[PDB]
Structures are given as C-alpha cells and as structure tokens.
C-alpha cells in the first residue's frame, strides 16, 4: 500500500495542516522560515529528477530525509511558558517521513515533491507567516 | 538588618477544625513574625473575600492551599526586599498587586496574614511590644470586654431570635478585676444551668446555648448569674445584645419576622415595632449595647433607631458597616448607629483597619475590635485594641483558648503597662451622653 | 556564584535608596507590565515568578560584588578565587608581519 | 550572654476559665522563654500537687497568686544567675528547693512553668527549634494522633460508662494527611449527629457528648462517620477507648459497677468479666487502644488484662501510673499494662518527664504525651512528643485552639523537618505484635 | 555563620598502624570539627563497606587515598553550603549521593568521617558539649564499661575458643570508681600472670592474651584477680564473654567445633549442647553477658538460647545483627538475643546509628556502643553512649590510649555533669529481670 496517490495528496494536505497546532489567538505556530531549507531541497530534487535518473538520486533523497529529521527536532517556539515544536508536528501529521520511505523511482519522488508544494501552499492559504 | 528576606505561608487549622493559613516573615537580622488569619467569608459583594480551594476531596472544599501558594509565589517575590517597618508601603503594594476591590485574586486571608506577620516582625526587630509599635508611645487603655455568655438565634434551638447575649463588666477598677468578674459570672451561670437541667456544653465562641423560654428568660437568667456572683446589675455589670436582625428579616415585606427562631406563635414586628421592642428591653433590663438591631439594608430603620435610643444605648453596626470605610462614612453622614464592629479579616489589611478605627473615632463613634467564629492562637486583636485606645473589645466567652488567648494577652499588656495602664469601663462608652 | 558575594556597601546603598520598593515586573517575553497583571500571570502560570522582576537601579557606580573568603587547612582566611589554579599559558603567538604600513 | 537575669510569673486563665500561671525567663543577651502551665489537680496521693489560693472570694478558691509569689520571691532568686542551658541543674535545684515528694511547698505548677520557660529560653538563645534542643539532632518522628471524638462517663449524661472514644488515623502517610482525615471524620460525625437530632456543642476537649443508647451505639456511629468520610475502619482509622474504670469501680465489692452511668439495668462485672467484655469489644470493633481498663488499684486485674490482651491492643495506664516513676517501675516488673500516659504537670519538671519517657521506652512500653482538661495556648507537649520520638500523642479533638494549637505546632514541626520527617502510624505501636 | 564552607580530608594512621582517614569541617564563622574513622571491613554482604586503594605497593593495599579523594572532590562540593546543624539532611544527602545500599561507591569510612566532623563542628558552633548536641538536654547516664581483660580464640595461641573475656564493674557507685576498679583488677591480673610465668604483653584492644589450660582457667584467674584487688565477684564485678562462635562453627555439620582453637581433644557441640555449655558456665561463674554465643546464621539456635538464658543473662548480637536495621527488626520479631552491639562504622552515618539505638531501645534491648580493633584518638563513641543514655559501653582494656581516650572522655563528661551524672551499673541491664 501507499500513503500518497495522484488523486489525494492535495486533499491530504488539507487534513495535514488543518490539524496543526495554534496559539490561543488562533494564528499558526509553524512559519516558512523554519521549513525554508526543506522546501529548497525538495524543489531542487524535483528539478533534478526530470533530467537525471534515480540510480544516482538516492543520496539526495537520503539527505532530504536526514534534513527533515533534523529540522523537526531542532526548531522550537515557546509561547506562554509552553514550548512547542511545529516542524515535528508538521512532519508527523503530514506523514512526510513515511512518504520519503516509499520513494523508489522518479514518479513517486515527483509525487512527494508535489505533496510538499501542496502542504506549503495550503499552509500559506490559512494565514501562515513567512 | 530590617530588610525582609523571607515570607512563607503554610496551611494550618483554626478553632473549628477548618483550614486557614499562617504567614512567617524573616528579616535580615533574624527578626521573626508570625501572623495567623481568622476564618472569614469567601462570598460577599461589599467586603473582602477569602480564597478557598473549592476541592471537595480535601477538607470539603475549604482548603487554603491556593492562598498559601499566592503568598509563597506572588506576595513573597514582591515583598522580599522591603523594610519590615514599612507597614503602609507593604500593605499598599499588596493591595495594588491584587488589583480588585474585594481582594479576591490573592485572597483577603493571604493579604491579612502577610500584614500581621510584617507588623509582628517589625515589632520584634524594634524590640518593642506590638501595641507600642502599632499605636505609638501613648498606649494605655485596656478595653472593656463584652463577654458573650448565652447564644440563641441560629446558634441554638431555643426560641430566641437574638444571636448573642453578653455581659459587660464596665464597673470594674481594672481589666484584671473585669476578667475575674466575667469568669465568676460564667461559672455562676454554669451552676444555674446545671441546676435547671439545661445543656452546659459550649459553642464556637465559648458560651452556652440553653433551651430558654424566650429572650426575657435568658436575660433574667443572666441577671441571676450576675447576682449569684456577688455583683450588681446596672452598676457593676451590664448586658449587651447581638440581635443579628438580618437573619430573621423578611426583606420582601419589609418586616422583622421573629417566627423564624421563636416558633410559629412569635410576634411579627415592623421597623417601628422593632424599635419599640428594643426600647422596652432597654427599659426593663440594664442593656448598654445592642448590635445589629436592624437589617444591614434598613437604613431608615437604623436612622430611626439611632434617633430613639442612640443617646443612652450603644448601637453597633456589624453587618451594617462590614468594616467598610465607605459604609461607615455613609452611616456617619446619615446619623446611623454610633458604633462599628471592626473585623480585621473583613477588610484584609492592618492599614485599612486603623483607617476605619480612626474614621470611627473622629466621628464620635466607638470602634469595637471583634473576633470571628473560627479563631486561632494569634492574639493580635488585643494589641490592636490597646494600640488604638479603642476602649472596647469583643473576643468571646471565658471558655476556650481561641477566646482566652486574647484575654491573656490583655492581662500581659496590663501587667507591662503597670501604673500607666488605664481601665475606663463606663467611660469607654464616650459615644453615649453623660 | 560562589567565588564572590554581594558587597556590604552595595547592600546598604540598595537598602536606604529603597530600590526594592520600586520593583518593575515583566512577562514571559520580558515586557514591562503592572504588578496586577504580573500577579495574574504568575497565578495562571504564564509568568515565572523567580526571573520576572527587577530592583530598580542603585545610583553611584558602586561595585556590586566583593570577593568571598574561606578557611585553609591551617585555619587561616583566604580569598576563594586565588590558589593553585592550573599551569598552561605558553608564551605568545609572534606572527612576524614586518610589512604592514602602520598609519601614524 | 546565657545567664538567667529575670524570672517572672503572672496569673492567667486556662481554657476552662480557671486561673493558671505563666512564667517568663529572660537572659543577659535577650533570650526569652514563656511557659504556661496546664491545670492539674490540687489533691493526689502520689502525684505532684499544684498550689491553689483557697480564697473563696477570688475565682472560687482556684487562684494561683500564691504560686506566682512563690516563683517571683523564692524560685527567681535561686534560679537567677544560672546558665539558661542548664535545664537539669535548674530542675534539680527547684526540686531540692521544694523539699517535698509531691512538690507541695512551692507548687508543681510553679516548678513546671519555670522549667518550660527555661527550656524555651535556652532554645531561643541557641536559635534552634525547641524539639531540637529537647531531644537532640535525631528528632524526626511525628506522633500518631489519638483524637478524642465522643465523650461518655462523667463527661456526658448519656448511658455510657466509658469516658472517651477516640479515632487513631494510623493508616495515613504523613501527619498532615492524618490531621486532614481526623478533621473530615470529625465533620462527618457532626453531620451524622445533626441528622439524628443529637447535640453537637463540644466539651472540654473539643469532642461531642451526644445522647447515645450505649457504648456499642457510639462505636457504631464513629464507624459510620469514618466510612462517610471515605476511610476504611481497621486499615486507615482505628478506635481507642478511655474507659476510666476507676470512676465506676466498687472498691469493697471489687466489681465494676456500670450502673453508675448506664442505669439500673447495667452489668455489674467482676475483674474477669470486665476482661471478657473488653476482649469482646476488641474482637467486635477495630479497637487498637484501651486506656484505664482496670481500676488504679486492681493490680491483679491489670496483670490479667495484660496477659489476655497485651499483645494485640495497647493498654495505657493513666491513673494506674500517674506519670510516677515508682508506679511505672512496679508495673514493668509485674507485667501490668504496656503503655503509660505522660502528663508533664503530674510529675513537675521536664527532666522527670523525659526520665519517665525513657524508662517506659527501655521496657518496651509506649509513652503517650497527653493534654489536661484545662489547657493553654502553649504547645510544648507537641515538641516533647517529637523530641522524644514517642510516636503517639493524645491532645484532644479537632475543635478548640486549646487542642488545635498542638496540631498546628506538629504541622509546623513536620514542615520544618521536611524530607526527614517520619510518620509511622501503626509502626508507632511497637508494644504490639504484628 | 553556620554554613559549611570547607570540607578537607587526609590520610592518617590507626592504632594498628594501618591507614584510615580524617575529615575536618570549617563553617563560615570558623566553627571547626574533626572526625576520625575507626578501621572497618571492606567486605561483607549486609554491612557498610569501606574503600581501600588496593595498591599493594602502598601500605600493603590498605591505603585510604581513594576515599580521601572522594571526600575532597565529590562529597565536599555537595556538602558545602549546607547548614552545619542539618545533620540528618547532610547524612541523607551523602547516602543518596553514594547511591548504594552498602555505601560502596564513596566508602563508608568517608561518609562516617564527614558525619562525625559535621556533628562536632555543629557542637562547636553552638558552644555546647557533643553529647548535649547529639542527645539533647536529658543526657546524664554514664555507661557501664565491659572492659576486656583476657583474649583467646583467633587473638591468642591459648587453647581457649572464646574470643574475649571482660570485667563489668556494675557494682561501682560512680564511673570514676568503676574505672579505678577496672584499672586495679587489670594490674592485679598483670601481677598474677607475672608470678605464673605467663606473658603480660597486650594485644590490639589492650588486653592480655596468655596461654591457659582452657576457658575455666581463664575465668578462674580473672576471678582471682578480682578478689586480689579487693572486690567481690558477683556483687562488685561481673564476668562477660565474647565467644565469637562464628569462628569455630562448621556450617556443613551444623556443630560448634572447639577443635579449631582448643586442640584435637576438644569437644564438638551441637546447638543444644552449646546452649547447655553456656548455661553451665553461667551457673558456675558470675557471668552477666555473653556475646555471639551462637553462629550469626543460626536463628533457631539464637532463639533457643534466648529462651533459655535470655531472662537472666545478656545476649549481645555482634555478627548476628551487624548493626543492621533489618537484622535487628528480624531478631526483635523472632525473639532472638536481647542486646545489639552498635559499631558506628558498620553503617557509616550517625543518623542511622541513633536510629538503630532507638529501635533496639524500644524493643527492650540494650545498645552497647563498641570500639573497633583499629581505633583512633577520636573519642566520639563515648559521647554517643552518653547522648543516647545507652548505659553500656565496650571500649577495650585499660592499656593503649586508643581505649583510654574513651574512658578519659567519659571521665570528662561525668565531671561536667557533676551532680546530674548517673551511674546505673546493674540497673543499666534493663533487658533482664529484677
Ligand atoms: Mg455580628
Ligand atoms: Mg483518663
Ligand atoms: Mg565481636
């Protein structure tokens, strides 16, 4: 089975980000400045998957995965004497790591990159801050 | 050396087994003060409220851990660093830190405990008695005590609507003799009740609650006890009343219903009828004090009662004034009552207590320092009464250490003052003509 | 801080300049707030009561701190910040550079 | 610096409105101690006797002015100049100055007041807690409270021969929890008695004296109160008795006549039948303590009672030993009782109190520091109980500051001890087996 | 001024020439305390173990540099900042920091040295005697000394299986007279051994180890010395034994084989035979105490020995209880022995030592504060014995100052106590009858 298909990743972004945490005032906790490097790596990898095949793109995917697992644990926002870790909850709710595990060829890799684009797009839709 | 370095509150019990708190203040040089808070009321629109936990698992919702934490976490950080002799500054800082008129955020118990502990620590640092520190060098007057001896109303199943009956030994030469007279009258009444077959166990304030036939029966038995001890009613010992008339007041019909406590056949009295009844009681018996003779909202009734009886009988507003400077000022302007009952926990701070006492004194009123139903081993109200030269105290009966501690402190103060010590007695009722 | 203590002169200056009677209060973000909202926030747990206030300012450039003392094995007094310490200093790092046009 | 400069006694009131004395001790450096004496007995065959005025025109012959003059004019001159930390030397000097076995010349109250004041002044000089001064560094055990909750015998008019029924919260983790449990059971019993239409006004020790049908009715109502508060009888809270069998004991008929308190239809039992009755009560109810189960002179009955029940229920001798070292030694030699009730005013000094406690401990007996009927705001007995690590205290009910002051002092001691504080509960009954 | 500022440790020598450590504690005001540690055992399943360096090049592996470094680096940074009077808190902190049931990480010697140094520094800060600080105001009993006279077992080549023989001058009026009697009997026995050709050189504890014809010869010679000094055996001076039956017990056959120390012709006894032999020795000689009469693992045999001889003879468990709380509790519950030998370095903390003393006292046992074979010039166990009012001490013979220092400290304590000091003697054996 697979968690990302071409018919549902957009709608999956809806359920991934609608359940993200929020401050008491209602604004979001994640900001674009925390997921900037992840989006840059995903965009570059999607860009290179068009011309270069997958047998030498495995290391870039492993770098993207270790970067996800780093930025999830590193970033933290402390509000009202309460610490929160927004990138980790984005990865947890959006199943980013599990999608990264199923990347085996060009098509699934491009689907994962488009899923990341959907996630950031819809995060900007509901008032995300840069 | 006098800089406060530690403020610590802990939850203790009171005289009724219900939780209260005590605060300890330590200064730099080692001066120590401990203030315990009598239990008051956590509800009330125009009086300071106390902070209770409300957790029904612990103490039936009467725990004071919340207010203890408010002292240990909020008040302690602000107060530590002040000079211990800056009583007014510390009190105003606590009032500003609370921010509410009723002191409901921090709790009036918390603020009062810190206030008492700071005053006692300053007195300990100065190596002076507490009354000397509070009232200055001119502290000489020993209060005339109103000793509760018989309880009715809500504190007894007898058909009596008056909550408390008291003896006032205003004919004594000294306070020591007044205390001896009160104890001997207490024991004579105990013997009379034992012969009569009535119950002799004491209540919250140390007095008896027998099953009398009525108010007249209780007053006559009190007079019999006074005469059995060898003292003259109306010359040596007088009688005070705490009607607590707000309890049996039918506010909807603007009438005083004695049927609530005195049975189905009890008389029904309007404001004028209630004034007439109080006047008849004053004429029949040596009654020198009537407390809460009208409802806390019957201002016209209070004005009429003061116009009729105020020239010869002390009229005290307990629920009428609620230790409120605003209510006391309104009563002074409208000639309602001629005395105020002063409870330190109903206002929450020693500075405001002394402000209310000064306002009452400047208008010809007498300020009566009082106790609450649940007291402690803290006997600060005796030092408050002597320090203000108030001349009257109401600290219960002669039978429990929650009451006896204040009398013992007054005995200690009188022994310290020596020849300087004064007991006015009947002259402490300066609000009355002649 | 164990090597030092608060000096007696600074403590006296803080005492009767009365700087503790003019405390300022801050929230969790370090913004100045009135004592009422400070108490509110501390009660609700949105402010740490320990590190959230300041004792105004002591005027006069006084040294805040004096050396703290202790007892040696001889029973003598000694400053806490002096002693065997360690021994690693080298000499210097002479970097030559005998060509830099030094401005007058 | 620690040399005693001033010893001064004054006459104050106790919790029952009767006079007692208090002694203040001042040293050179300004250390201060105040000791207040509980009211004892002016008559006794081999117990220390207090000095009363016998002036029927003053306090009904219960004045303590003679003992005040004895402290001020005899003891003060002998003791001034001593080191305040020489407690044993001062107590020995006072005992030799009295010159009589029962301390009748000076009065046991005078000597006890000076002893307590000297000990407290020495603790004040050393800036140590009083229990630390009295018992040394290793003072950690908070006593298991034996809280009186229902009165009988001569303390009530109900048909119950036994004088006191008590709750022992030996299943609590800490003393704070044990006190909360005792207060909640007290209030639950108050609610139950209000529902049944029984009297609630408290007695001398703060407990109730309701109109019960008998001993079994009172024990069952106490069990109902324990369960209403939410605690398991026999696991969390146990029951103790103070029979005071010397009150209903026929000396010449050698029988325990229950008819003195339980009507003409009561059971007049011999010593053996009394043993079976106590064994029946122990097997029926979760009773862990019985006090004065036999007469003060029924030595054979006490030995038989200890043989029958001494391994599962604590047997306390109050009038059996009257805190007398000779009586305690004889009872240890004859295997009579397994616990002694320690009353500091029945022996005279703190040195002899601690000697009696250590003699009881060395024989496997339990020392129970006890209150008197007339108490004060002084709470030295709590410090005695903690300092000796006695593990048990009997300081009354949960309803008067004469009793609540000791519980508050124990709360303060537990807070001060912190992590080293120990509450042992059932482990405090080391005289029992399993 | 009482804040612990400096904790230093150094390596010193004991009485045997083997290394040990000492710890000095300086507080802020300059109060000073030095604690030396007696040499203990680094091995043992249920006793606190001491830390040795194990370097065979230095002191034969017995150096204490590791534990000195533990005090100087590990313990000192944790303890500095504590209050010197917080002995229980400091001891609990050291136990927690060790984190081992037998204190094997830091070493029991290190922890005990810091405990003793802290207690002595606290006594110096308070300017009070060490026994007064440790035991409070009621410290008066000078212990009865069981002092070694003759050695055997593994300490001697004689055909005697019993490790130690002791004289107990329990008939003396004071401790000074008891010490004089012990010294005179020691010198009389020295003269008797010289006139018999036996060697009068002393061992580790200061007593003689001559070659005899058996146990009976040794006890006969000791009785002859007692009579030659002028005292009555059985009234003035009694005989004590220390069999150390664990040395000559074969666990496989469950028999006490005297053939290990008495030769090929010695008798092999079972548990019942051993108890019979101890009973015959008791019935033949004025023997008042027997220590380690049965093997440390023979609980049934210990129970039988206490059943037979435990009423009239003291039975001390040295290796039976190993100063362990759990073993003492099990022995109390099982009725095994009636006394415990307390060695302060067998647990490593003063708090636990006093806890064991009170636990033994509350069960009717006696606590005998005991020296070690490698002792120091520290004489703290004398103050421990006086502070707890144990009434018995065991500090070796009347020769090497490692023993005489404790006797000199007890002489000093008796001199300071003056008229207050009590020498109970035979009355300190309260675990017996009559
Ligand atoms: Mg009122
Ligand atoms: Mg009794
Ligand atoms: Mg041994």
From Swiss-Prot, chains B, D, E:
Gene3D superfamilies: Enolase-like C-terminal domain, Enolase-like, N-terminal domain. Binds a second Mg(2+) ion via substrate during catalysis. The active site is at 205 (proton donor), 343 (proton acceptor). Its EC number is 4.2.1.11. GO terms for biological process: glycolytic process. Keywords: Cytoplasm, Glycolysis, Lyase, Magnesium, Metal-binding, Secreted. It catalyses: (2R)-2-phosphoglycerate = phosphoenolpyruvate + H2O. (2R)-2-phosphoglycerate binds at residues 163, 343, 372-373, 394. The keyword Manganese does not apply. Mg(2+) binds at residues 242, 291, 318. It is an enzyme of class 4 (lyase). Pfam families: Enolase_C (PF00113), Enolase_N (PF03952). GO terms for cellular component: cell surface; extracellular region; peptidoglycan-based cell wall; phosphopyruvate hydratase complex. It is found in: Cytoplasm; Secreted; Cell surface. Its cofactor is Mg(2+). Pathway: Carbohydrate degradation; glycolysis; pyruvate from D-glyceraldehyde 3-phosphate: step 4/5. SUPFAM superfamilies: Enolase C-terminal domain-like (SSF51604), Enolase N-terminal domain-like (SSF54826). One of its GO terms (molecular function) is magnesium ion binding. NCBIfam families: eno. Belongs to the enolase family. This is Enolase. The lineage of its organism: Bacteria, Bacillati, Bacillota, Bacilli, Lactobacillales.
């Amino acid at each position: 089975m697979a968690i990302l298909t071409d018919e549902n990743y957009v709608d999956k972004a809806e359920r991934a980000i609608s359940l993200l945490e929020k401050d008491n005032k209602g604004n979001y906790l994640l900001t674009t400045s925390q997921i900037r490097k992840l989006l840059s790596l995903c965009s570059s990898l999607y860009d290179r998957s068009k011309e270069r095949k997958f047998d030498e793109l495995i290391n870039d995917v492993s770098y993207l995965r270790v970067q996800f697992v780093y930025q999830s644990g590193r970033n933290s926002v402390r509000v009202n004497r309460q610490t929160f870790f927004p990138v980790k909850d984005l990865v947890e709710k959006g199943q980013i790591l599990e999608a990264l595990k199923e990347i085996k060829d060009r098509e699934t890799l491009q689907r994962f990159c488009r899923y990341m684009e959907a996630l950031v797009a819809y995060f900007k839709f509901y008032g995300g801050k840069d | 050396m006098s800089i406060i370095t530690d403020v610590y509150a802990r939850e203790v019990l009171d005289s009724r087994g219900n939780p209260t708190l005590e605060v300890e203040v330590y200064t730099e040089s080692g001066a120590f003060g401990r203030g315990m808070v009598p239990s008051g009321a956590s509800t009330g629109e125009h009086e300071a409220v106390e902070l209770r936990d409300g957790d029904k698992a612990r103490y039936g919702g009467l725990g004071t851990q919340k207010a203890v934490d408010n002292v240990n976490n909020v008040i302690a950080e602000h107060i530590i660093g002040f000079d211990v002799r800056d009583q007014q500054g510390i009190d105003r800082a606590m009032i500003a830190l609370d921010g509410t008129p009723n002191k409901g955020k921090l709790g009036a118990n918390a603020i009062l405990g810190v206030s008492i502990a700071v005053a006692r620590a300053a007195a300990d640092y100065l190596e002076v008695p507490l009354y000397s520190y509070l009232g200055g060098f001119n502290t000489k007057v020993l209060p005339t005590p109103m000793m509760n001896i018989i309880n009715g109303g809500s504190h007894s199943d007898a058909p009596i609507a008056f909550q408390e009956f008291m003896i006032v030994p205003a004919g004594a030469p000294t306070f020591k003799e007044a205390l001896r007279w009160g104890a001997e009258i207490f024991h004579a009444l105990k013997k009379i009740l034992k012969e009569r077959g009535l119950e002799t166990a004491v209540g919250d304030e140390g007095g008896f609650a027998p099953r009398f036939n009525g108010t007249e029966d209780g007053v006559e038995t009190i007079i019999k006890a006074i005469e059995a001890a060898g003292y003259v009613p109306g010359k040596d010992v007088f009688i005070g009343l705490d009607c607590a008339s707000s309890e049996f007041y039918d506010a909807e019909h603007k009438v005083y219903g004695y049927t609530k406590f005195e049975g189905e056949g009890a008389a029904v009295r309007t404001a004028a009828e209630q004034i007439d009844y109080l006047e008849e009681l004053v004429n029949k018996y040596p009654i020198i004090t009537i407390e809460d003779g009208m409802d806390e909202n019957d201002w016209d009734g209070w004005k009429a009662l003061t116009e009729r009886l105020g020239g010869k009988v002390q009229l005290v507003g307990d629920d009428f004034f609620v230790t409120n400077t605003a209510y006391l000022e309104k009563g002074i302007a409208e000639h309602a009552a001629n005395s105020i009952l002063i409870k330190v926990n109903q206002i929450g701070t020693l500075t405001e207590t002394f402000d209310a006492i000064e306002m009452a004194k400047e208008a010809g009123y007498t300020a009566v320092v009082s106790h609450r139903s649940g007291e402690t081993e803290d006997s600060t109200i005796a030092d408050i009464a002597v320090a203000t030269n108030a001349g009257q105290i109401k600290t219960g009966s002669l039978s429990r250490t929650d009451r006896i501690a204040k009398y013992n402190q007054l005995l200690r103060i009188e022994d310290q003052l020596g020849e300087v010590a004064e007991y006015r007695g009947l002259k402490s009722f300066y609000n009355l003509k002649k | 801080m164990k090597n030092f203590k608060i000096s007696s002169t600074y403590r006296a200056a803080r005492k009767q300049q009365k700087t503790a009677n003019r405390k300022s209060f801050y929230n969790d973000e370090g913004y100045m707030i009135s004592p009422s909202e400070w108490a509110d926030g501390v009660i609700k747990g949105l402010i740490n009561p320990k590190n959230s206030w300041s004792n105004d300012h002591v005027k006069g450039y006084l040294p805040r701190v004096s050396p703290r003392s202790h007892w040696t094995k001889n029973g003598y007094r000694e400053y806490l910040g002096i002693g065997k310490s360690r021994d690693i200093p080298e000499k210097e790092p002479e970097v030559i550079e005998m060509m830099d046009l030094e401005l007058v």
